[PDB]
Structure 1
Amino acid sequence: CIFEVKHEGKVTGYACLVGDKVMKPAHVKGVIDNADLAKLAFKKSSKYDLECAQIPVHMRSDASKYTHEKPEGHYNWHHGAVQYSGGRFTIPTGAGKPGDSGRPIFDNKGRVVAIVLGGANEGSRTALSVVTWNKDMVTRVTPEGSEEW
């Protein structure tokens, strides 16, 4: 489900197969390091800093489901455990760096809950700037002073 965006042979961010679309942050330079995915036609959306396309039938079995359901508590992500509360995802400052955009924040059942775009450093912890699903529609939460990863 996770695929890496490469630029001049260097990993810039990530791309993710969520729902029936193929996502990757718009700000990420490079092209998805996967033939099938790279040749697709993406629809940019500067409001959401998102850039989606549709998953080829032969990879649709490889998508990851999403969900609007996110109760205060701890979520899972590649570098550890994210914490959700007050309508804000955070992590121990230092555990997320530039080049982590595109990485999904899963819950304990595997449902992708948000997609990291960058983070604002507010001391001990960094409030993440993510793309998250609302009632049905996509949304983007960007804490004051975010540094786009």
Structure 2
Amino acid sequence: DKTFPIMLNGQVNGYACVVGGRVFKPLHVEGRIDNEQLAAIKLKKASIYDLEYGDVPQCMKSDTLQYTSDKPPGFYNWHHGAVQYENNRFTVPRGVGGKGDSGRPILDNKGRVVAIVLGGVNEGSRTALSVVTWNQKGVTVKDTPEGSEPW
């Protein structure tokens, strides 16, 4: 797995992570990408999408496995423990999921990155997030609960 922080002013401001099929960088924030191999790659950002085009030589291509439909409620391994929910983002503990750690992938226990967080700072006594994943049939759609800011 290659999940890389983004270098801004010599400190971490983002967190770039490569995914199956295409290499991914969260283009919501800026900062020089730490990896030198990615340091010479053109940027392809859409109006609302903040994703890097996959231009890694196909030796290390598809570092991960993408995620299909049929979301279970079960455990998804997160950087800070497992997450367990199905209707929307898991009720992450308070304090966790704040700010400054943009671009963190939530993966299945089977190695299938279910979604990519793009904010969702607080959602009450619990907290869900604003993320993007396949819609129902494999459509890269973002869902943003109200009160969502990059985390």
- TM-score above 0.5, yes or no: yes
Long gaps (5+) in structure 2? none
CA contact (8 A) 1:43 1:51 kept: yes
User: What TM-score results when the alignment is normalised by the length of structure 2?
Assistant: 0.87
Residue 83 of structure 1: aligned partner:
84
Residue 142 of structure 1: aligned partner:
144
Superposition deviation, residue 7 in structure 1 = 0.6
Identity level (%): 60
Superposition deviation, residue 22 in structure 1 = 1.4
CA contact (8 A) 2:88 2:128 kept: no
Q: For 2:51, give the aligned amino acid.
A: E
Q: Given the superposition, is the C-alpha separation of residues 89 and 43 from structure 1 closer, same or farther in structure 2, using an over 3 Å criterion?
A: farther
Residue 133 of structure 2: aligned partner:
132
Superposition deviation, residue 123 in structure 1 = 2.0
Q: Given the superposition, is the C-alpha separation of residues 90 and 23 from structure 1 closer, same or farther in structure 2, using an over 3 Å criterion?
A: farther
Q: For 1:65, give the aligned amino acid.
A: L
When structure 1 is superposed on structure 2, of 128-137 and 3-12 the one drifting more is: 128-137
Q: For 1:80, give the aligned amino acid.
A: G
User: What TM-score results when the alignment is normalised by the length of structure 1?
Assistant: 0.88
Q: Given the superposition, is the C-alpha separation of residues 123 and 2 from structure 1 closer, same or farther in structure 2, using an over 3 Å criterion?
A: same
Superposition deviation, residue 45 in structure 1 = 1.9
User: CA RMSD for the aligned pairs?
Assistant: 1.7
The runs of 4+ residues in structure 1 deviating greater than 4 Å are none
In 2: Cα distance, 1:23 partner to 1:132 partner: 13
In 1: Cα distance, 2:60 partner to 2:100 partner: 24
Matched length: 147
CA contact (8 A) 1:75 1:82 kept: yes
Q: Given the superposition, is the C-alpha separation of residues 132 and 90 from structure 1 closer, same or farther in structure 2, using an over 3 Å criterion?
A: farther
CA contact (8 A) 2:133 2:142 kept: yes
CA contact (8 A) 1:74 1:82 kept: yes
Q: For 1:64, give the aligned amino acid.
A: T
In 2: Cα distance, 1:80 partner to 1:99 partner: 18
Long gaps (5+) in structure 1? none
Q: Higher helix proportion, which one?
A: 1
Q: Given the superposition, is the C-alpha separation of residues 46 and 89 from structure 1 closer, same or farther in structure 2, using an over 3 Å criterion?
A: farther
Q: Higher strand proportion, which one?
A: 1
Structure 1 residues 1-149: aligned runs within 5 Å: 1-48=2-49, 50-54=50-54, 55-60=56-61, 63-69=63-69, 70-134=71-135, 135-149=137-151
Superposition deviation, residue 17 in structure 1 = 1.1
Tell me, what secondary structure is at the counterpart of 2:142? Answer: strand
In 2: Cα distance, 1:91 partner to 1:10 partner: 26
